[PDB]
Write a protein that binds this ligand. Structure first.
Ligand code: HEM
Length: 116
């Protein structure tokens, strides 16, 4: 599915090709950008703090755990997605891998069955 790998500062290091389709951002555009360019406010501005809370407390809030959140596409549109984070380490520094599963279709179907 879509996969994003960030370092300990929230900077994107690898943006798979499906992520490009899903978010709109190309690989070269994504890499180097902080992951918070993928979420609306208030989380955008506080996403770094969330990561900082975890790097100092060593207390996992959403690691392993799979969570449903709102992603933001390049054209400004938000959408729900399921995200699962796996923590890793390379060259001494920590890295984080996110596996996104688009849920837009599941949210639309649900709204539709609601509406009928
Ligand atoms: C793109 C939509 C995203 C949103 C809305 C989002 C939102 C959040 C929120 C609200 C928190 C804190 C949750 C809590 O402490 O209970 C958090 C933590 C974090 N997020 Fe995200 N996130 C997004 C994507 C990502 C991605 C793609 C990565 C992939 C590496 C990632 C990695 C992290 C990490 C490492 C933390 C800290 C985890 C922790 O405190 O346990 N996030 N995120």
């Amino acid at each position: 599915d879509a996969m994003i790998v960030i370092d300990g500062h929230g900077i994107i290091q690898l943006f798979s090709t499906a992520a490009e389709r899903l978010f709109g951002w190309s690989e070269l555009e994504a890499i180097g950008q902080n992951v918070n360019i993928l979420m609306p406010e208030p989380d955008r501005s506080r996403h770094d703090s969330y990561i900082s809370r975890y790097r100092t407390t060593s207390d996992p809030h959403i690691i392993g755990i799979g969570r449903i959140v709102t992603g933001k596409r390049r054209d400004g549109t938000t959408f729900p997605m399921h995200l699962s984070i796996g923590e890793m380490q390379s060259g001494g520094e920590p890295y984080f891998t996110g596996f996104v599963r688009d849920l837009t279709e599941h949210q639309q179907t649900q709204a539709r069955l609601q509406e009928l």
